[PDB]
């Protein structure tokens, strides 16, 4: 439209294209290659690669139909002739290398990570997307958000966006832009991310800012359609990162912010020396982070605590408890050759800890080396309960922190409906995978299957409900299994959960008790295979997850699932001086949180966002077709589009249908659901072009346009017929006048001729004369 605001948003296409020569042939580097057939030979087709101009043969049933230049960089792929793994990958990759990272796949959106900042989120751009209908303006995430708003409003129901994708794709960035969008059409809301991300994110090999907790944020709206409140829910924070961090990875962001000197004034409040590589608990893996300024992030994080409305004490309570942790791990120890119970190796660092938590350093190390009926601990039983404490504190801080930020957002204003946004942590496969990952992965599964349900299983159901017409289609997309292998009655987790309650148990009775149940009785469970990446640590079994095969090491899974902090120290802290500090298995608990989340989701009109990681190098604008193509597979994109093209997108409530299409067979209408049964029956309508429904009618594509055709026609006729009626009334009205005047004239004509001839009568003449 000439609008500068569309530089990286609007698509910028002819000749050399033979619909019978040109096709898609499998490739190892690009996934699919542009080929031009040369010679058939039964099944052995011989094509020429347009690129290098090399030649090769390919099974005939492995060629894919290419799309004509008519659909270059198409905005909506459901409108393409061919929706196959090679047409889709080509369209995306086409757009992507041109700045366009958003594309509709039918009813849901596709976002391909830019790995660079784009001027497409400005307020200038937001102005243009407001109240726009998806086809009206280029593809954009705003459009998805803007539309969910309109639906909640007009349709009067809750909306929801499940933004999915792999780890490092764009789930978080896009979730934030949605809120930022909905907020712009408030300040604290936007400001809750900086603090939650500082405490629940960390550098990882995959993501320099990896989210380590699940986030579901609902945004409430009032009677004038404006933001009237908001709440946040979080899930499974990586308690483990606190004390441990695999190489090339960092601990949570805060810890590094705290040791930068963004606010020197605070150094003495926390008792920290501005050196991160000084504290064991946070210098295991990485220290710095290409493109993350811990100095400035600390400032902004501090700045954000203010805007959130945090008293200075409150926000110093936070900072201290977390700096305290930086010390729990500095407390050295020793034995004392004899019994070993264990003795300390100083007390300097163990005091700073008791200090910051407002408890006696004495009473501490005491209830830590001989927990009370007493029961002393050895030299490791201690260093490990130290970690048990660090982890458990941080899990309470993070939880309290969220409760508090909701305090600031649960405005008691008036709520109508809302729009939630789900950002759950995605699939991730590392060199070594353990309980933490199974949990994240089980989580991500789960979700995918939701899309499968609501997308295929679902669509057809409604067709039935409304009572339209249709024949089923098996898209073969179910993971209930994988899901089942992990969650169901005797599943993986259920086995582990019943294994924790036994003090006798260990990493081997658990490992054996597992094969005992699923080896060979479920094909998703398979003995560990062979290395597909160097440094590939131990693996005890493999799971075939939607987006990958994961070799899981089950060592230490028993303690990881049953938490364990000296019930003693919990007493110390129970009555600590600091006001903050003073204030079921994990598996079962989480399984439950998750089930509850899912339950909350189902009651929604979902709009889906699909994130896609362009490559394994974290560099921008570079594509790895194999990987891309690979995602366009485990995510169900293509199929996700077939039904949009295949299916019955119409839908009408018999109440509004009877009112609009009764006038098409009124000589058959003596209940809104039967009246229509009649109308559409009268019209001798093909059972094909429509379907039943409980509360609504489903008309195949185009049909409704054609009904509005017949609808007009009749409405025009009828209007003519009433005009005919008016023509006939006026005519007949003036009928006497032509019969009446014919008489009324004969009177006058015959009755004047009389008075005329009577005056020409001698007698009358003479008579008239005498008169006087």
Curated annotation (Swiss-Prot):
Residues 18-68 form the Myosin N-terminal SH3-like domain. Residues 72-712 form the Myosin motor domain. Transmembrane segments: none annotated. It is found in: Cytoplasm, Myofibril. It comes from the Eukaryota. Residues 715-742 form the IQ domain. ATP binds at residues 165-172. Residues 594-616 are annotated as: Actin-binding. Muscle myosin is a hexameric protein that consists of 2 heavy chain subunits (MHC), 2 alkali light chain subunits (MLC) and 2 regulatory light chain subunits (MLC-2). Belongs to the TRAFAC class myosin-kinesin ATPase superfamily. Myosin family. Muscle contraction. This is Myosin heavy chain, striated muscle. The chain holds residues 5 to 835 of 1938 of the full protein.
């Amino acid at each position: 439209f000439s609008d500068p605001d569309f530089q990286y948003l609007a698509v910028d296409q002819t000749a050399a294209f033979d619909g019978k020569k040109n096709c898609w042939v499998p490739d190892e580097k690009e996934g699919f290659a542009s080929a031009e057939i040369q010679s058939s030979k039964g099944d052995e087709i011989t094509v020429k690669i347009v690129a290098d101009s090399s030649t090769r043969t390919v099974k005939k049933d492995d060629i894919q139909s290419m799309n004509p230049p008519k659909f270059e960089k198409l905005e909506d792929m459901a409108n393409m002739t061919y929706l196959n793994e090679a047409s889709v990958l080509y369209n995306l990759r086409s757009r992507y290398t041109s700045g366009l990272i958003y594309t509709y796949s039918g009813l849901f959106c596709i976002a391909v990570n830019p790995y660079r900042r784009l001027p497409i989120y400005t307020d200038s751009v937001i102005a243009k997307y407001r109240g726009k209908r998806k086809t009206e303006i280029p593809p954009h995430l705003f459009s998805v958000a803007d539309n969910a708003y309109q639906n909640m409003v007009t349709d009067r129901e809750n909306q929801s966006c499940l933004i999915t994708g792999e780890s490092g794709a764009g789930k978080t960035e896009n979730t934030k832009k949605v809120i930022m969008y909905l907020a712009k059409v408030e300040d604290q809301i936007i400001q809750a991310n900086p603090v939650l991300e500082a405490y629940g994110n960390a550098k990882t090999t995959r993501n320099n800012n990896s989210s380590r907790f699940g986030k579901f944020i609902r945004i409430h709206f009032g009677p004038t359609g404006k933001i009237a409140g908001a709440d946040i829910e979080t899930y499974l924070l990586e308690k483990s990162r606190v004390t441990y961090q695999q190489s090339a990875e960092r601990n949570y962001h805060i810890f590094y912010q705290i040791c930068s000197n963004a606010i020197p004034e605070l150094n003495d409040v926390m008792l920290v020396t501005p050196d991160s590589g000084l504290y064991s608990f946070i210098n295991q893996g990485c220290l710095t982070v290409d493109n993350i300024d811990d100095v400035e992030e600390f400032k902004l994080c501090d700045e954000a605590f203010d805007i959130l409305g945090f008293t200075k004490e409150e926000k110093q309570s936070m900072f201290k408890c977390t700096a305290s942790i930086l010390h729990m791990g500095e407390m050295k120890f020793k034995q004392r050759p004899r019994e070993e119970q264990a003795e300390s190796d100083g007390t300097a660092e163990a005091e700073k800890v008791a200090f910051l938590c407002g408890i006696n350093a004495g009473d501490l190390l005491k209830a830590l080396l001989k927990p009370k009926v007493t029961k002393g601990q050895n030299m490791n039983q201690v260093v490990n309960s130290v970690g048990a404490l660090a982890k458990s504190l941080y899990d309470r801080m993070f939880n309290w922190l969220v409760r508090r930020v909701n305090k600031t957002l649960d405005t008691k204003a008036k709520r109508n409906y809302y729009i939630g946004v789900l950002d759950i942590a995605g699939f991730e496969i590392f060199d070594f995978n353990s309980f933490e990952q199974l949990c994240i992965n089980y989580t991500n599964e789960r979700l995918q299957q939701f899309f499968n349900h609501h997308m295929f299983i679902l669509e057809q159901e409604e067709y039935k409900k409304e009572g339209i017409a249709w024949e089923f289609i098996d898209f073969g997309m179910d993971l209930q299994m994988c899901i089942d292998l992990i969650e169901k009655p005797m599943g993986i987790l259920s086995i582990l959960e019943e294994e924790c309650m036994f003090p006798k148990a260990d990493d081997k009775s658990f490992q054996d008790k597992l094969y005992q149940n699923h080896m060979g009785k479920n094909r998703m469970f398979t003995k560990p295979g062979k290395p597909t990446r160097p440094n590939q640590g131990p693996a005890h079994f493999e799971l075939h997850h939607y987006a990958g095969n994961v070799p899981y090491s089950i060592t230490g899974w028993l303690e990881k699932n049953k938490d364990p902090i000296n019930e003693n120290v919990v007493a110390l802290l129970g009555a600590s001086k600091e006001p903050l500090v003073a204030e079921q298995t994990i598996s079962a608990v989480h399984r439950e949180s998750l089930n509850k989340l899912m339950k909350n989701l189902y009651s929604t009109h979902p709009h889906f966002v699909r994130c896609i990681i362009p490559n394994e190098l974290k560099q921008p604008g570079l594509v790895d077709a194999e990987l891309v193509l690979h995602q366009l597979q485990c995510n169900g994109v293509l199929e996700g589009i077939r039904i949009c093209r295949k299916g019955f997108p119409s839908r009408l409530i018999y109440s509004e249908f009877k009112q609009r299409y009764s006038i098409l067979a009124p000589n058959a209408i003596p209940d809104g659901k039967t009246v229509s049964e009649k109308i559409l029956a009268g019209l001798q309508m093909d059972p094909a072009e429509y379907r039943l429904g409980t509360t609504k009618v489903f008309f195949k594509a185009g049909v409704l346009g054609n009904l509005e055709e017949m609808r007009d026609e009749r409405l025009s006729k009828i209007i003519s017929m009433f005009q005919a009626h008016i023509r006939g009334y006026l005519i007949r009205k003036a009928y006497k006048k032509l019969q009446d005047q014919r008489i009324g004239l004969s009177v006058i004509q015959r009755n004047i001729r009389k008075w005329l001839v009577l005056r020409n009568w001698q007698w009358w003449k003479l008579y008239s004369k005498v008169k006087p």
